[PDB]
Design a protein around this motif. Sequence first.
Motif, mmCIF file in Angstrom:
data_model
loop_
_atom_site.group_PDB
_atom_site.id
_atom_site.type_symbol
_atom_site.label_atom_id
_atom_site.label_comp_id
_atom_site.label_asym_id
_atom_site.label_seq_id
_atom_site.Cartn_x
_atom_site.Cartn_y
_atom_site.Cartn_z
ATOM 1 N N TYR A 1 9.320 -22.316 1.961
ATOM 2 C CA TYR A 1 8.815 -22.295 3.334
ATOM 3 C C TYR A 1 7.315 -22.012 3.311
ATOM 4 O O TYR A 1 6.838 -21.240 2.476
ATOM 5 C CB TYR A 1 9.527 -21.224 4.167
ATOM 6 C CG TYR A 1 11.035 -21.329 4.162
ATOM 7 C CD1 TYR A 1 11.700 -22.134 5.083
ATOM 8 C CD2 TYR A 1 11.802 -20.616 3.238
ATOM 9 C CE1 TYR A 1 13.086 -22.235 5.080
ATOM 10 C CE2 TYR A 1 13.187 -20.712 3.225
ATOM 11 C CZ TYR A 1 13.822 -21.523 4.149
ATOM 12 O OH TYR A 1 15.197 -21.619 4.146
ATOM 13 N N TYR A 2 6.573 -22.642 4.216
ATOM 14 C CA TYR A 2 5.148 -22.368 4.334
ATOM 15 C C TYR A 2 4.534 -22.812 5.649
ATOM 16 O O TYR A 2 4.935 -23.822 6.226
ATOM 17 C CB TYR A 2 4.363 -22.959 3.155
ATOM 18 C CG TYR A 2 4.462 -24.458 2.972
ATOM 19 C CD1 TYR A 2 3.547 -25.313 3.583
ATOM 20 C CD2 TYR A 2 5.448 -25.021 2.154
ATOM 21 C CE1 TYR A 2 3.618 -26.690 3.405
ATOM 22 C CE2 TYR A 2 5.523 -26.393 1.964
ATOM 23 C CZ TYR A 2 4.604 -27.223 2.593
ATOM 24 O OH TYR A 2 4.669 -28.592 2.418
ATOM 25 N N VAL A 3 3.549 -22.032 6.096
ATOM 26 C CA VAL A 3 2.746 -22.327 7.272
ATOM 27 C C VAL A 3 1.653 -23.330 6.887
ATOM 28 O O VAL A 3 0.907 -23.114 5.928
ATOM 29 C CB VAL A 3 2.123 -21.030 7.834
ATOM 30 C CG1 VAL A 3 1.232 -21.310 9.039
ATOM 31 C CG2 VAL A 3 3.212 -20.032 8.198
ATOM 32 N N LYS A 4 1.572 -24.427 7.636
ATOM 33 C CA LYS A 4 0.617 -25.502 7.350
ATOM 34 C C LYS A 4 -0.720 -25.328 8.078
ATOM 35 O O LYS A 4 -1.747 -25.829 7.621
ATOM 36 C CB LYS A 4 1.229 -26.865 7.685
ATOM 37 C CG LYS A 4 2.440 -27.223 6.838
ATOM 38 C CD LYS A 4 3.217 -28.399 7.420
ATOM 39 C CE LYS A 4 2.889 -29.705 6.716
ATOM 40 N NZ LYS A 4 1.492 -30.147 6.979
ATOM 41 N N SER A 5 -0.695 -24.635 9.212
ATOM 42 C CA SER A 5 -1.904 -24.326 9.967
ATOM 43 C C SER A 5 -1.646 -23.111 10.842
ATOM 44 O O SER A 5 -0.512 -22.885 11.269
ATOM 45 C CB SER A 5 -2.335 -25.509 10.836
ATOM 46 O OG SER A 5 -1.391 -25.747 11.865
ATOM 47 N N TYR A 6 -2.701 -22.340 11.109
ATOM 48 C CA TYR A 6 -2.597 -21.160 11.967
ATOM 49 C C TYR A 6 -3.844 -20.927 12.819
ATOM 50 O O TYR A 6 -4.915 -21.475 12.540
ATOM 51 C CB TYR A 6 -2.285 -19.901 11.139
ATOM 52 C CG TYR A 6 -3.297 -19.592 10.047
ATOM 53 C CD1 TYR A 6 -4.426 -18.805 10.303
ATOM 54 C CD2 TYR A 6 -3.119 -20.075 8.752
ATOM 55 C CE1 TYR A 6 -5.350 -18.524 9.300
ATOM 56 C CE2 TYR A 6 -4.035 -19.801 7.747
ATOM 57 C CZ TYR A 6 -5.146 -19.029 8.026
ATOM 58 O OH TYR A 6 -6.049 -18.764 7.016
ATOM 59 N N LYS A 7 -3.685 -20.117 13.865
ATOM 60 C CA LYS A 7 -4.821 -19.556 14.582
ATOM 61 C C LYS A 7 -4.974 -18.097 14.170
ATOM 62 O O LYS A 7 -4.026 -17.474 13.677
ATOM 63 C CB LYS A 7 -4.644 -19.678 16.100
ATOM 64 C CG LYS A 7 -4.693 -21.106 16.606
ATOM 65 C CD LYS A 7 -4.423 -21.202 18.099
ATOM 66 C CE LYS A 7 -4.488 -22.658 18.543
ATOM 67 N NZ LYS A 7 -4.087 -22.856 19.960
ATOM 68 N N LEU A 8 -6.178 -17.570 14.349
ATOM 69 C CA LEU A 8 -6.453 -16.169 14.102
ATOM 70 C C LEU A 8 -6.732 -15.472 15.430
ATOM 71 O O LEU A 8 -7.492 -15.982 16.250
ATOM 72 C CB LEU A 8 -7.653 -16.033 13.169
ATOM 73 C CG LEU A 8 -8.348 -14.674 13.042
ATOM 74 C CD1 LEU A 8 -7.420 -13.634 12.430
ATOM 75 C CD2 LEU A 8 -9.629 -14.813 12.225
ATOM 76 N N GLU A 9 -6.111 -14.315 15.638
ATOM 77 C CA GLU A 9 -6.334 -13.530 16.853
ATOM 78 C C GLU A 9 -6.743 -12.112 16.479
ATOM 79 O O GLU A 9 -6.084 -11.477 15.650
ATOM 80 C CB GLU A 9 -5.082 -13.524 17.728
ATOM 81 C CG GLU A 9 -5.278 -12.865 19.083
ATOM 82 C CD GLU A 9 -4.075 -13.017 19.998
ATOM 83 O OE1 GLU A 9 -2.922 -12.914 19.515
ATOM 84 O OE2 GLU A 9 -4.287 -13.231 21.211
ATOM 85 N N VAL A 10 -7.831 -11.627 17.073
ATOM 86 C CA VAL A 10 -8.377 -10.310 16.729
ATOM 87 C C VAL A 10 -8.574 -9.391 17.932
ATOM 88 O O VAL A 10 -8.625 -9.844 19.080
ATOM 89 C CB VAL A 10 -9.708 -10.405 15.934
ATOM 90 C CG1 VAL A 10 -9.456 -10.964 14.540
ATOM 91 C CG2 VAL A 10 -10.754 -11.230 16.682
ATOM 92 N N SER A 11 -8.683 -8.095 17.648
ATOM 93 C CA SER A 11 -8.932 -7.081 18.667
ATOM 94 C C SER A 11 -9.659 -5.903 18.050
ATOM 95 O O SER A 11 -9.416 -5.542 16.896
ATOM 96 C CB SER A 11 -7.619 -6.595 19.286
ATOM 97 O OG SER A 11 -7.862 -5.743 20.407
ATOM 98 N N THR A 12 -10.558 -5.305 18.821
ATOM 99 C CA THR A 12 -11.196 -4.072 18.395
ATOM 100 C C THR A 12 -10.600 -2.875 19.132
ATOM 101 O O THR A 12 -10.566 -1.775 18.591
ATOM 102 C CB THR A 12 -12.722 -4.099 18.589
ATOM 103 O OG1 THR A 12 -13.027 -4.280 19.977
ATOM 104 C CG2 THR A 12 -13.340 -5.222 17.770
ATOM 105 N N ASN A 13 -10.118 -3.089 20.354
ATOM 106 C CA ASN A 13 -9.595 -1.977 21.160
ATOM 107 C C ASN A 13 -8.065 -1.881 21.205
ATOM 108 O O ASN A 13 -7.522 -0.907 21.714
ATOM 109 C CB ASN A 13 -10.203 -1.980 22.573
ATOM 110 C CG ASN A 13 -9.831 -3.213 23.387
ATOM 111 O OD1 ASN A 13 -8.898 -3.955 23.060
ATOM 112 N ND2 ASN A 13 -10.560 -3.429 24.464
ATOM 113 N N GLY A 14 -7.379 -2.890 20.667
ATOM 114 C CA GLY A 14 -5.922 -2.941 20.708
ATOM 115 C C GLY A 14 -5.308 -3.374 22.033
ATOM 116 O O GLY A 14 -4.084 -3.436 22.156
ATOM 117 N N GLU A 15 -6.150 -3.678 23.020
ATOM 118 C CA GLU A 15 -5.692 -4.148 24.328
ATOM 119 C C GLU A 15 -6.118 -5.583 24.603
ATOM 120 O O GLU A 15 -5.316 -6.393 25.066
ATOM 121 C CB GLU A 15 -6.203 -3.243 25.457
ATOM 122 C CG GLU A 15 -5.849 -1.769 25.318
ATOM 123 C CD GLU A 15 -4.352 -1.498 25.225
ATOM 124 O OE1 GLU A 15 -3.528 -2.380 25.573
ATOM 125 O OE2 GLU A 15 -4.000 -0.373 24.811
#
Lengths: 179, 182
Positions: A82-96
């Motif tokens: 099994y493998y992921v072929k493409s992804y998005k990245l999501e980030v946070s500094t405050n956790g909200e």
Amino acid sequence: FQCNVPLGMESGRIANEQISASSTYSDGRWTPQQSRLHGDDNGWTPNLDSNKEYLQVDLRFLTMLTAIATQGAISRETQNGYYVKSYKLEVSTNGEDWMVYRHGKNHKVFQANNDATEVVLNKLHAPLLTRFVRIRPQTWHSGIALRLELFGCRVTDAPCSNMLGMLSGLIADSQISAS
Amino acid sequence: SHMFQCNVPLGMESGRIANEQISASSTYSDGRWTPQQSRLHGDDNGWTPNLDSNKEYLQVDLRFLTMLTAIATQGAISRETQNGYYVKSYKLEVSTNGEDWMVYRHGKNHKVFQANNDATEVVLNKLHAPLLTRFVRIRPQTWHSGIALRLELFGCRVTDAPCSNMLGMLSGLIADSQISAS
């Protein structure tokens, strides 16, 4: 100095507790804690295969992210790949508040794995300030499976002047975009 | 108790910003209204361009990478004629590299700062958030009688503040523009 250091997935410097996910496969053999790069016990798989699913790392400390490495996984029980072929990245500094990482102002889709075993390294165009990191699979082969490593440096753990410059550079860049 | 604050006068009034660091698109043809006369609380007129138009500007090369947090302006009274002149509104344009210029923006539009209503009183405009910069241009939009400026800039030098604080401030700003992108 170079801001490319492995942030602790493979080494275990990122503790089990810091790793979570939207969900996990129901047999309990694909926990978020098995998502460490080069790990030999499957990997992370969600309860369902969808683009709403994600793997989360809490880095705790304010961190400059500069690269991401991913694998898929081979099943210990079934020997399927099994493998992921493409992804998005999501980030946070405050956790909200969460920002999907962007190419300009579009969602950056990272091209990921072509097999279950080979490490695929994506370097970011520029360092990304963050505390939390979500990998959001967009496309996959047979099913979602992830192993992961994150690269960069800790904001309060780099030479001051280098970091001051790096941060100034980033702010100047966004200002240049507003020209 | 020593509390660092990024609201310090950057040197217009004091002289810390040298004459050589101050320039303009143009200056009044009689030579009596040079850019170097645009220092806050100066008693020898102020800066006036050759023509009264919104295309004219006063420029400060801060040299060092600077956080701008506030702008204070005056008009000017003429030594020669005793006429009063003042800028009523202005736009702000900044640059870190000297080549790329960003006009300061309120949402989608250029920020039009409200300025002076006479030639003598200091009108202070605090920025909502500290702005990283190396050059400052004040671009008058409206005026009374003619364009005349005296000026002070406030903030802090990036490499002249305590590391911890600056690291936090710069991280703060980046985190804020990330929230703007949801």
